[PDB]
Coordinates of C-alpha atoms in Angstrom, one line a residue:
X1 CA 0.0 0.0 0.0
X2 CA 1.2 3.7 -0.7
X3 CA 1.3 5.0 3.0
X4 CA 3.1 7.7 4.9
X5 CA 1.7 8.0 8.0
X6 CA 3.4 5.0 9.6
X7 CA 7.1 3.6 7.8
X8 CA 7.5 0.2 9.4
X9 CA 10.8 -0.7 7.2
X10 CA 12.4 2.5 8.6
X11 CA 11.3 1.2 12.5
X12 CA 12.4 -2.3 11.1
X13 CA 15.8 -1.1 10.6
X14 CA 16.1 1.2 13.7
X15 CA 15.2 -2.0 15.6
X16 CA 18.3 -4.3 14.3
X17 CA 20.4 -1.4 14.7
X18 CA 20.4 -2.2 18.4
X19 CA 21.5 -5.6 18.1
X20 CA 24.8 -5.2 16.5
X21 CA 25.3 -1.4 19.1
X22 CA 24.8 -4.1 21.8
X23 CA 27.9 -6.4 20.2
X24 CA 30.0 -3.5 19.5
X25 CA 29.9 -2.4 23.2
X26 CA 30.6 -5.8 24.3
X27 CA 33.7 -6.0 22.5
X28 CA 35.5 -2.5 23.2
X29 CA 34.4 -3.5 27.3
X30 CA 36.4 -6.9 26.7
X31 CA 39.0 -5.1 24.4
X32 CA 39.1 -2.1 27.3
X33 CA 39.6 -4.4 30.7
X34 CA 41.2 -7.7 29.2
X35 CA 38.9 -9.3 30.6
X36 CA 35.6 -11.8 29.4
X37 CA 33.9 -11.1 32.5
X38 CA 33.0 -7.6 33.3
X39 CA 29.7 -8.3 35.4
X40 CA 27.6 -10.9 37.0
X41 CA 25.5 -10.8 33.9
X42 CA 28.6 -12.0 31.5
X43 CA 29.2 -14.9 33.6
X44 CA 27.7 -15.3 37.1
X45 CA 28.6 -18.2 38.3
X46 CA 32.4 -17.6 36.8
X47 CA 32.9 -14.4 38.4
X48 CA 32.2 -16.1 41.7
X49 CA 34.4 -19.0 41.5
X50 CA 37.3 -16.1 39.5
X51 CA 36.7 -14.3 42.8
X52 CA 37.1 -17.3 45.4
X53 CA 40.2 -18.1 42.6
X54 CA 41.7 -14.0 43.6
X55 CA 41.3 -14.8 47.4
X56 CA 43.4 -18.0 47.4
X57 CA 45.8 -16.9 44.9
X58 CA 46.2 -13.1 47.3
X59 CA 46.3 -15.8 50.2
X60 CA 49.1 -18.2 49.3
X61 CA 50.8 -14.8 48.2
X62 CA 50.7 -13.7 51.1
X63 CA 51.4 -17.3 52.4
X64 CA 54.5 -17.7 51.4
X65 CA 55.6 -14.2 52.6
X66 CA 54.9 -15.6 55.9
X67 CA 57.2 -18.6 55.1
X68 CA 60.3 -16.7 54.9
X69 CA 59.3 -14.7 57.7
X70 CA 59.3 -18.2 59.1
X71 CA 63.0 -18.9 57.4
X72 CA 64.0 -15.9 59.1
X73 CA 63.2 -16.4 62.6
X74 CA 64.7 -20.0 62.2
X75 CA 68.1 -18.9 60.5
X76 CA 69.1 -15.9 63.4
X77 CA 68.4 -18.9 66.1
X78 CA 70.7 -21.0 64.3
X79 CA 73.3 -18.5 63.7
X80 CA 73.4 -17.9 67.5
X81 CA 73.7 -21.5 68.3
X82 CA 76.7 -21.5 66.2
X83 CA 78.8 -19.2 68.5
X84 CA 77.0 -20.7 71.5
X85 CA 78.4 -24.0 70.1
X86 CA 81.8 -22.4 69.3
X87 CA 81.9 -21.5 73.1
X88 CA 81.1 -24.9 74.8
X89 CA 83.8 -26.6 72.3
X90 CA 86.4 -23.6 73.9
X91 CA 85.1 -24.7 77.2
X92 CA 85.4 -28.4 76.6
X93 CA 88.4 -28.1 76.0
X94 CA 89.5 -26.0 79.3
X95 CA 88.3 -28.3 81.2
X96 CA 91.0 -30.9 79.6
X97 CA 93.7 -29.0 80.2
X98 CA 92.5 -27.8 84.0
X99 CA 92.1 -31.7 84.6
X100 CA 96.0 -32.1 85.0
X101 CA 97.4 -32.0 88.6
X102 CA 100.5 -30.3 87.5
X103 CA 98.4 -27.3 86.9
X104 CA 99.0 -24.9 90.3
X105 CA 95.5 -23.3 91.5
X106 CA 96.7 -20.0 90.3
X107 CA 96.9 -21.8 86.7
X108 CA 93.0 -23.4 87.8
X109 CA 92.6 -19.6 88.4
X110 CA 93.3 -18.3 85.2
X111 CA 91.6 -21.1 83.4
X112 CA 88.4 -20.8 85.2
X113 CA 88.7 -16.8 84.3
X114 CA 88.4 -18.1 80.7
X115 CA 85.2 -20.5 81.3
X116 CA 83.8 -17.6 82.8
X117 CA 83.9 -15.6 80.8
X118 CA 82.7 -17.9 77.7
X119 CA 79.3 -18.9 79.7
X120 CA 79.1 -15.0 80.4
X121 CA 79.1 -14.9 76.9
X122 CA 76.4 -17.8 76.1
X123 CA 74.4 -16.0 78.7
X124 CA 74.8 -12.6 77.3
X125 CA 73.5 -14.3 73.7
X126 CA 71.1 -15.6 75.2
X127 CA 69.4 -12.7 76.6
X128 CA 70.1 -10.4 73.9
X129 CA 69.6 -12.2 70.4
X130 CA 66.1 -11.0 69.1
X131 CA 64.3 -11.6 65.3
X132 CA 61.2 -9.0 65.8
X133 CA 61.6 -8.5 69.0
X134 CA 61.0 -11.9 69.6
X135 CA 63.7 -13.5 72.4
X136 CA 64.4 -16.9 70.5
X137 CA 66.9 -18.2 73.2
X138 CA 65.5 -16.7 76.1
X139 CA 61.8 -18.8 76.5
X140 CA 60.3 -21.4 76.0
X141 CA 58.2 -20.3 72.9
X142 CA 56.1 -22.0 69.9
X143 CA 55.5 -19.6 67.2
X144 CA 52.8 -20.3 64.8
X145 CA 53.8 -19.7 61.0
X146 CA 50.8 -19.1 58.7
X147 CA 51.2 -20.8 55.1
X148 CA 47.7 -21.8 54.0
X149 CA 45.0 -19.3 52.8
X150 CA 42.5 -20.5 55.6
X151 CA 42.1 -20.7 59.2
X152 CA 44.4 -23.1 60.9
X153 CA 46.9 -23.7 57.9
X154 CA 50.1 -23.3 60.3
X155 CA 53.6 -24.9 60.8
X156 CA 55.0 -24.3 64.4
X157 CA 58.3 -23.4 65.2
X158 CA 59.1 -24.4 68.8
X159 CA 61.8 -21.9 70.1
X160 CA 63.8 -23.0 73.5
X161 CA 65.6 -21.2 76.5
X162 CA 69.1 -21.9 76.0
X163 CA 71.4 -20.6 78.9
X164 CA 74.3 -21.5 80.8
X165 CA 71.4 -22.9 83.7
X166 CA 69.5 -24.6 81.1
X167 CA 72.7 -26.2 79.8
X168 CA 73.3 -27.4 83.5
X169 CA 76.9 -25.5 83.5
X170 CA 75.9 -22.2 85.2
X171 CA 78.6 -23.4 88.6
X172 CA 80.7 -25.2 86.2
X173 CA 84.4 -24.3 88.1
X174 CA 87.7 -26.2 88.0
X175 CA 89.3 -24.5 90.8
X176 CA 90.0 -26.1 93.9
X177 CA 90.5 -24.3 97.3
X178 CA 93.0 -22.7 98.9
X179 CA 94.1 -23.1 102.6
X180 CA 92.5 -20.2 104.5
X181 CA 94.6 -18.3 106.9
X182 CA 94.7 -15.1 109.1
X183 CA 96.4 -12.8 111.5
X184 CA 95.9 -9.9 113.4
X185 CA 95.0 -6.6 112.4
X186 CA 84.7 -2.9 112.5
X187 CA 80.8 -2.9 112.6
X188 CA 78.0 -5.3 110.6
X189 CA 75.0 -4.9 112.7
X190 CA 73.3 -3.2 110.3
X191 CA 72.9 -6.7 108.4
X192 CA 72.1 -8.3 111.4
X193 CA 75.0 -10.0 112.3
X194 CA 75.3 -10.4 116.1
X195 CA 78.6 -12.6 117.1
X196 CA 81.8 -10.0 118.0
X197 CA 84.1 -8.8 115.2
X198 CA 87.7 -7.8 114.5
X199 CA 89.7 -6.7 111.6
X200 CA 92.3 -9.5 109.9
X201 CA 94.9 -10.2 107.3
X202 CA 94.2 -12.8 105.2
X203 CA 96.3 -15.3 103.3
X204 CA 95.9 -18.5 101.1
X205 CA 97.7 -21.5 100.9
X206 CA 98.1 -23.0 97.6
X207 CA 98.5 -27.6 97.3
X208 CA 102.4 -26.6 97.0
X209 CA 102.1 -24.4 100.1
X210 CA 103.1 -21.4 98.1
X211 CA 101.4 -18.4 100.4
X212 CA 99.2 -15.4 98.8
X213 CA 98.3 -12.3 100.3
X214 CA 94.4 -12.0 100.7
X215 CA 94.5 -8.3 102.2
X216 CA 92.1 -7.3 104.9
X217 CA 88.8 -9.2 106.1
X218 CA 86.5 -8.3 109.0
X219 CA 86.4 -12.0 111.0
X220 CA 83.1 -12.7 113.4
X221 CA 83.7 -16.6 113.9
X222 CA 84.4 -19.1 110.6
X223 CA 82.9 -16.3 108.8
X224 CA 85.1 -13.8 106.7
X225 CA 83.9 -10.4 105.3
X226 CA 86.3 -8.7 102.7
X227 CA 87.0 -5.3 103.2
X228 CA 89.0 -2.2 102.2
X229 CA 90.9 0.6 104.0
X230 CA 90.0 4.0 102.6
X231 CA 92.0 7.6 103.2
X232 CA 90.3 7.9 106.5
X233 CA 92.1 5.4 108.2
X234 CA 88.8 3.5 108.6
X235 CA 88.3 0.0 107.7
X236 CA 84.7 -0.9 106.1
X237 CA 83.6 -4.3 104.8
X238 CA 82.5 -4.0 101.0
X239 CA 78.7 -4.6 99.6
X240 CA 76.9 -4.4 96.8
X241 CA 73.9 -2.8 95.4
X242 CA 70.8 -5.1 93.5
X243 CA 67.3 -4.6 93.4
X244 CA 65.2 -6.8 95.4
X245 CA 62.2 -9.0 94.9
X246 CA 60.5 -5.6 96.7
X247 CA 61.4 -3.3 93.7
X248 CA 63.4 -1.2 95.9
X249 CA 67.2 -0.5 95.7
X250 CA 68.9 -2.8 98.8
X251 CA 72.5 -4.0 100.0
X252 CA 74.5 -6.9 100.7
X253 CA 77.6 -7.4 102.5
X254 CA 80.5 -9.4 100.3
X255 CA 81.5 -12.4 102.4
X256 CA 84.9 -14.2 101.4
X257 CA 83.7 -18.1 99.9
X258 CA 83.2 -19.8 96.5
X259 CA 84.7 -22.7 94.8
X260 CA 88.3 -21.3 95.5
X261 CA 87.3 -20.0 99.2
X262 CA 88.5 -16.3 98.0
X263 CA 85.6 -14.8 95.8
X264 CA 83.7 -12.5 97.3
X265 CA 80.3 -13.5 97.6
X266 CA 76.8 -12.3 99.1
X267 CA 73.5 -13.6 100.9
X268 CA 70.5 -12.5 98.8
X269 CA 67.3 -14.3 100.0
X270 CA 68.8 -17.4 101.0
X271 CA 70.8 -18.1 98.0
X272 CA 74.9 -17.2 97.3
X273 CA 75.6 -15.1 94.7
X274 CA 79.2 -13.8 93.2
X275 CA 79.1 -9.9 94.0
X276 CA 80.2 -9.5 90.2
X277 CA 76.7 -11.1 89.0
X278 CA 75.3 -9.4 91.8
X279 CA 76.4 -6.2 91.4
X280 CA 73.4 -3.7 90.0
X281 CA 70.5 -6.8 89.1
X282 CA 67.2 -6.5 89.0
X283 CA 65.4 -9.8 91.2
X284 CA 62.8 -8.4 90.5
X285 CA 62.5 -8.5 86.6
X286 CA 64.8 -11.4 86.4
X287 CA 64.6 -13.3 89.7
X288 CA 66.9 -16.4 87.7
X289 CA 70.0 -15.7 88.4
X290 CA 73.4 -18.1 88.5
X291 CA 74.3 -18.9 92.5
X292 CA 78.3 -18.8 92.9
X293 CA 80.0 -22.1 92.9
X294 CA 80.3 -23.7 96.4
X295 CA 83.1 -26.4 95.5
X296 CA 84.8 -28.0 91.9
X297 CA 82.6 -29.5 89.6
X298 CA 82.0 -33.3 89.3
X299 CA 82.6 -35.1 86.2
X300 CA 82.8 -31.4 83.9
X301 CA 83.6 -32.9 80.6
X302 CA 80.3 -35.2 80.9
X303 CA 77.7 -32.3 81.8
X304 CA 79.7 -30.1 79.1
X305 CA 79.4 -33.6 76.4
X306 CA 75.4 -32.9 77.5
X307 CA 75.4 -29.4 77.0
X308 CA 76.9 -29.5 73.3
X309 CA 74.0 -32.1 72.9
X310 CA 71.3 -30.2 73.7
X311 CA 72.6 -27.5 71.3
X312 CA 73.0 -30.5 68.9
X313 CA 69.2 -31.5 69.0
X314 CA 67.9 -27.7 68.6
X315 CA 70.1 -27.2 65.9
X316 CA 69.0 -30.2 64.3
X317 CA 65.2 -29.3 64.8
X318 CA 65.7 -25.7 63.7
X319 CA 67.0 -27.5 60.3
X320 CA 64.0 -29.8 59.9
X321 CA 61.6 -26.9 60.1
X322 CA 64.1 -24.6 57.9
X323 CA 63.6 -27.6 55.4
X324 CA 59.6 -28.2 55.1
X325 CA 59.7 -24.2 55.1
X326 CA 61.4 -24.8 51.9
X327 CA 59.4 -27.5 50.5
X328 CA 55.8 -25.5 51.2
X329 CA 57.8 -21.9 49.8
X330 CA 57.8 -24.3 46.5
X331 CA 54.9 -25.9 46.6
X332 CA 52.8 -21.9 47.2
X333 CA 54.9 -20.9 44.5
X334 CA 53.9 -24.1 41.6
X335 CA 50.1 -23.5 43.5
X336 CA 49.9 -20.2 42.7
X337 CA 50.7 -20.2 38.9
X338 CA 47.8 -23.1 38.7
X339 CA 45.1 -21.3 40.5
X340 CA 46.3 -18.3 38.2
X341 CA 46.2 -20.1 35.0
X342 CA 42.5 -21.7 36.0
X343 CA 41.2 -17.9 36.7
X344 CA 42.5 -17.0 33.4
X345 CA 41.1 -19.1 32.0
X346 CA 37.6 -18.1 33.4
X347 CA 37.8 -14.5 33.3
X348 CA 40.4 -12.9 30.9
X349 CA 39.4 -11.7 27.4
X350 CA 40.6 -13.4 24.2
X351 CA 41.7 -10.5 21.9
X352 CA 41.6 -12.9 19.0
X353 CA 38.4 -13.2 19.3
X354 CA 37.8 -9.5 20.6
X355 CA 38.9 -8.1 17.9
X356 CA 37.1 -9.9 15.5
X357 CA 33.8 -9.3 17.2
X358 CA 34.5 -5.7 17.6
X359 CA 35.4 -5.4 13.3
X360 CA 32.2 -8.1 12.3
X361 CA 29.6 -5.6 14.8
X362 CA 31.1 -2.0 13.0
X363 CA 30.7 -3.2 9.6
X364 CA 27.1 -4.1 10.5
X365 CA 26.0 -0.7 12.7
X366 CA 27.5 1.0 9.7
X367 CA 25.5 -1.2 7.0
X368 CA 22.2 -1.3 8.9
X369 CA 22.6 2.4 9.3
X370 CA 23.1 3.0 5.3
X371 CA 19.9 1.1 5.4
X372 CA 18.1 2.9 7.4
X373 CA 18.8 6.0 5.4
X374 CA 17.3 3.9 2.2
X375 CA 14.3 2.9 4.3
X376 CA 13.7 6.6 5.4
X377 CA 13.8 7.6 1.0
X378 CA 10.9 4.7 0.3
X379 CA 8.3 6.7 0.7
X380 CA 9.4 10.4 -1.0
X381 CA 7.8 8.3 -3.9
X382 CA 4.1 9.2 -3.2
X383 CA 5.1 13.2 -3.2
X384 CA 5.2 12.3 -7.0
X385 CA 2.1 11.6 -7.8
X386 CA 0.8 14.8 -5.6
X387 CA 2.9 17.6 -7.3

């Protein structure tokens, strides 16, 4: 029919128009992000299992960041054993040479200054060897190491107090004592000590009976208190300062005792201290502290075989954990690249294709819209038979 009021063919053509304006959009989005899925209406049930992909693949990321955290904590414990190993060995082998009686107790002496100062020194590692702030020789510690994505996915590291008491060698001493002697030559009531008192000379007799001048004590029975003679002319006996189980600053009066009967040593609670360990602690915030050595130690080179053996088994379990720390860093590393190669799969864009859709859809909006101007001209034809 010739009519002009309606022109389907030209609402015919506007209508397909849509369909390939709906293509072309789809594939610039795809082309734009790189990826196939852009909303829940591409894909819904792929976006949701591309998103629970992102979370594990961000969580054994993240994962394996904890691992060498892990490694870390693990390798500064081990490095510290070495030198804590590297001082028993020293050690060991002090207590072989102090074992031979031609040694005098002034050789004994200077050996045991050694040994002293070496568990001083596995002490002082001890306390002071940190990783995060984290005191891996000083407790009894297990540390939890995340390496899973989910709740509970841990390795443990279990971290031990290594010390010179721990190690059973905290009164290790190869002296032996001298003879004690005085002659001849002062207040402690103050400490409470009630017997009467005079000032003395001291010496020691070595196994040879070589004799060595102790200087002045204060004597109140078998009990000897060391003491010093100052510009005044007055004698007092020495102390030292520590802070008590009370938090408050206190004193102690140095007694003349030990292993070698000629270290001065002090009553705090009812325990004997060396005045030189003594000296300035805090009982309070560390109320472990070494006592002094009362006599020589019994069978030194077995407890000092034990001590190298427990070093032995920590080191040992420090590698085992250093090693599966390993093996699961590998294992999150080949797990990642497969969970990212399966969301890829799901949610990333195929240019390829892209492309192609995007070139097929213009040529279409731009021959449908060609059309459309040729629908509109269908019907100028009836003006014709008006004019």
């Amino acid at each position: 029919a010739q009519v002009i009021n309606t022109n389907s063919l030209s609402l015919l053509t506007q209508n397909n128009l849509n369909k390939s304006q709906s293509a072309l959009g789809t594939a610039i989005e795809r082309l734009s992000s790189g990826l196939r899925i852009n909303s829940a209406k591409d894909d819904a049930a792929g976006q949701a299992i591309a998103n629970r992909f992102t979370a594990n693949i961000k969580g054994l990321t993240q994962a394996s960041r904890n691992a060498n955290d892990g490694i870390s904590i693990a390798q500064t414990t081990e490095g510290a054993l070495n030198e804590i190993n590297n001082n028993l060995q020293r050690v060991r082998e002090l207590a072989v040479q102090s074992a031979n009686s031609t040694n005098s107790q002034s050789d004994l002496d200077s050996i045991q200054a050694e040994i002293t100062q070496r568990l001083n020194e596995i002490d002082r590692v001890s306390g002071q060897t940190q990783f995060n702030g984290v005191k891996v020789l000083a407790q009894d510690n297990t540390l939890t190491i995340q390496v899973g994505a989910n709740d509970g996915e841990t390795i443990d590291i279990d971290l031990k107090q290594i010390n010179s008491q721990t190690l059973g060698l905290d009164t290790l001493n190869v002296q032996q004592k001298y003879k004690v002697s005085d002659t001849a030559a002062a207040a402690l009531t103050a400490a409470g000590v009630t017997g009467t008192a005079s000032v003395v000379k001291m010496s020691y007799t070595d196994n040879n009976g070589k004799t060595i001048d102790g200087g002045l004590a204060v004597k109140v029975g078998d009990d000897y208190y060391s003491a010093t003679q100052n510009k005044d002319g007055s004698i007092s006996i020495n102390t030292t300062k520590y802070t008590a189980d009370d938090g408050t600053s206190k004193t102690a009066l140095n007694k003349l005792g030990g292993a070698d009967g000629k270290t001065e040593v002090v009553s705090i609670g009812g325990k004997t201290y060396a005045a030189s360990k003594a000296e300035g602690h805090n009982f309070k915030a560390q109320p472990d502290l070494a006592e002094a050595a009362a006599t020589t130690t019994e069978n030194p080179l077995q407890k000092i075989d034990a001590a190298l053996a427990q070093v032995d088994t920590l080191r040992s379990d420090l590698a085992a954990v250093q090693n599966r720390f390993n093996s699961a860093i590998t294992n999150l590393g080949n797990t990642v690249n497969n969970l990212t190669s399966a969301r890829s799969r799901i949610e990333d864009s195929d240019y390829a294709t892209e492309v192609s859709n995007m070139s097929r859809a213009q040529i279409l909006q731009q021959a449908g819209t060609s059309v459309l101007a040729q629908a509109n001209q269908v019907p100028q034809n009836v003006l014709s038979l008006l004019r």
